[PDB]
Each structure stands twice: as C-alpha cells, then as structure tokens.
Symmetry: C3
Subunit: 160 residues, 3 copies
C-alpha cells in the first residue's frame, strides 16, 4: 500500500501550417498544428512517458511505433489509455498527474479545463488528481519564436 | 496519511540591464536582473507552480495576474506564501521541495543556503525538507549565452 | 516508513567531434562525444543531482568539486555510488529512479538495458525500480541540431 514510484516526462513538437493543433486531446482553432507521425499531442505524450517511467516500463517509443504507416495520425488519447492499461497490468494504480505546456501561442487558458477532463477520463481519475499548467517561455529560444510547443509531466503511482 | 501527490514546475526569465537580480529571495550583485511584471524571481515561480500542480490547483497564471488589488506590487515571496496558503486551504501539507537553477552567470553557490532558508521560512518547512541546486547550461542556447535564467522544481505534498 | 521525499535533476553537455560518447556508463559508437571535466556522462549526472535533491543534500557540484583530490579521475559511476552512500547515511532509502535522455542521434534504444543495469548496480536497486527513456528534440534548437545532449531525472526516496 506504500510502494510508491515517480515518473517524469518531456516532449516537444514543431508547429507547422496544415496540421490540426491537438493538445490534451483538445482540437484548438489555430492556423498551425503540431507535426508528428501521430496526431502529435505533445501533452499526452509527455504524460504517457511519465506513466511508463513511473512503472519502469521503458518509454513511449518502446510501446508505440512512431513509424508504422497504419498508425499515421493516431489518436494520442487512445495511446494514453493503452499506456494506463499496461501500467495497471504491471500492478500500479495512478495517484496523480501534473503537467506544464510551454507555448508562445495560441492562448491555452480557455482549453486547459477540457484538457484536464480528457486526461482524467483516460486515466480513470477524478479531476482533483489531474493538473495541467500553461505558460510562455518569456520570449526566449525556439519556444519564444513560436516554432514548437513543449510539454512536461510528472506522475505518482503505487504498486498495489 | 498516505494520499501523496507530486508536482513539477518550470520557469524562465530574461536577463536585462537596470533590474536587481533576485533569485530565491536573495539579491545577488550583478549588472543585470530578471525581467517580469513581478520581481521575476524565477526560482520562486517554479516552486510556486510545482506546489499548485501537486495540489491540482492549476497554475501561477490562473492564481496571480488580474491586477488583483491585493497582489499588484507583490514580490515573489509574498506570492509563494499565498500559494502555500492556498495549498493548505485545499487540505494538503507540504513534505519537501527540490529545485535547480540554470544560469551561466553569476556564481550562485555562495547564495544557495540563503535561498534555502528563505524558501523554508516562506513554506513553514524545516531546512532539511528544502533543496536548491545550481548549474550552468554549458554555453548552449539562450541560457548558455546568458540571455535568461531557468528554474525547475519538484514538490511532494500529502492530503491529510 | 512514510517520510517520502522527491528529487529532480537536469544536465546538458556539448556534443562535438573528438571525444567518446558515454551515457549511463555505456560507450556508444558515434562521430561525436560529450564535453566536460569528468567523462561528461549527462545521464548519471542528472540522476546524481536528483538523488542529492531528494535527500536535501545540495547538488553534484557541492559534493564533487573538480578540484578535490579525493575525486581526481573519478568517473561518473564512481560519483553516483558515492552519492548513494551519502543519501544512505543521511537516512534515506531509494525507492525508484526515472529519467529521459534527449538527443537527435545516435539511436539509444539498443543501450537502454545496459544503462539501467549500470544504474541499478550503482544504486543497489532492483532493475524494476530504474527506468531510462530516450527521445529526440524534433530538430528544434541546439538539441535538435545535434549540438548537445540533455538528461532529466526524477528520484523518490524514503527516510528510514
Ligand atoms: C503513431 C503512434 C501509434 N505512435 C507514437 O506516437 N509513438 C511515439 N513514439 N515517441 C513519441 S514522442 N517522442 O513524440 O513522445 S510518439
Ligand atoms: C505580479 C503577480 C501578482 N503576478 C504574477 O507574478 N503572475 C504570474 N503569472 N505567471 C508567472 S510565471 N509564468 O513567470 O511563473 S508570474
Ligand atoms: C570531476 C568530478 C570529480 N566532478 C564532477 O564531475 N562534478 C560536477 N559538477 N557539476 C557537474 S554537471 N553540471 O556537469 O552535472 S559534474
Ligand atoms: Zn510527441
Ligand atoms: Zn516567472
Ligand atoms: Zn554533467
């Protein structure tokens, strides 16, 4: 009941024209979107990595081919749910998730609660155990220039 | 007694002429200082965000910046104290904080213990539950060119 | 048995021709290697810092100076083992480590189990409490251009 473990995750994707902008499962109106083989949901990927890492199950690349042509455009919420299923199968219950999105644009405040609800649904958690934070990079670097979006995540689990 | 939660925080600010350099509440001699509407204490901001995240209370931007009369002109220590108040209000106790400052200059080593003492006082924690680390970015990127200073933080809390 | 603490770590080193590439104690064939005073093992440095952080013992630069004769010529595994000894003597047992390497190249997945094996040995941990993840920076910034490699780490300990 006290075999706790922590995990941490990081991800970044380029912002490009002609792609949907999907963050935290939310399709956000914007002239650009994130580039990747999947739907490129940088927030869900970072959380997925934190969960695999807390369970010592490797990482998102190990579990989900980023090159399989059948999976082009994959829904990263389906990947997050399969991650959670494998973490559970390994014997772990999720206690909480925290995360940060770093972007110059668009404004993410109107979308954060929806992201939180998506993640909570996918992890079978109440809202009070999931947190999504959003901020800019204060004009510095490629994030300041709006060339990509970063996400960070932390997860606490317990082996039952 | 076992409802633990983790949070993670990140912040960065530009280094600019004509501002005092204040990190972890410590005024450090230096020809530049951090830019922000606040006093731009990047370390206290990262710790603040980690604490809000561990309590699933959102983030520093949702708590502090509507030109709220109580917080205009507030320094980052007052805001850290208020964050800790709101964490307690939600029924959480803080168990520990860890953090890293990334800066090419100036030398922060002589100031680390004063930062730790300031954070401990603001969070009503013993010293042995607060840690601050500092390193350079090996001359890489905007941190490496001395254009900004980054802070990272992790916090463990428990819902009593 | 319930005095849990969390720590976090970060490191980066430049990647240029002329030095071997050593990560997690593994020598990896590559046309470039990491620059630093010791062996520049960016992954072990980040994990070392997360462990000192969780124990609130400061950081790797305060424990292992480049000037101290005791550690002249010590490689990063020797430093990691001494870190673990100090964490133990401060009264903490390590519960788990998670980490991420960010590099555009080479492919690190073939070397992950070797890194995990080295880390678990140095920390006297079962293999299923040590995790290493690896991903690219999607061609963004100095990491995306192959000009350096970053590592992030998270550690959970408990005071015994
Ligand atoms: C296309 C889907 C099924 N597979 C997928 O998305 N795999 C990934 N592997 N690493 C990633 S990362 N580095 O962007 O978090 S996403
Ligand atoms: C001036 C005070 C009252 N308000 C304030 O400091 N608000 C912030 N919002 N985000 C921040 S961050 N992203 O630089 O940590 S600081
Ligand atoms: C040369 C050995 C004995 N000492 C050593 O390597 N100390 C460090 N201090 N900071 C580091 S960092 N910033 O690259 O993680 S490594
Ligand atoms: Zn991704
Ligand atoms: Zn800030
Ligand atoms: Zn290093």
């Amino acid at each position: 009941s006290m075999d706790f473990r922590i995990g941490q995750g990081y991800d970044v994707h380029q912002l490009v024209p002609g792609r949907p902008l999907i963050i935290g499962g939310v399709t956000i109106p914007y002239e650009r979107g994130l580039l990747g083989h999947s739907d490129a949901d940088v927030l869900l990927h970072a959380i997925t990595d934190a969960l695999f890492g807390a369970a010592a199950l490797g990482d998102i690349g190990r579990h989900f081919s980023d090159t399989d042509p059948r999976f082009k455009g994959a829904d990263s919420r389906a990947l997050l749910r399969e991650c959670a299923s494998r973490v559970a199968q390994a014997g772990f219950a999720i206690r909480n998730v925290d995360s940060t999105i770093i972007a110059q644009a668009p404004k993410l405040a109107p979308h954060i609660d929806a992201m939180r609800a998506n993640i909570a649904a996918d992890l079978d958690l109440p809202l009070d155990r999931v947190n999504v934070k959003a901020k800019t990079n204060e004009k510095l670097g490629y994030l300041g220039r709006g060339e990509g979006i970063e996400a960070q995540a932390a997860a606490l689990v317990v082996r039952e």
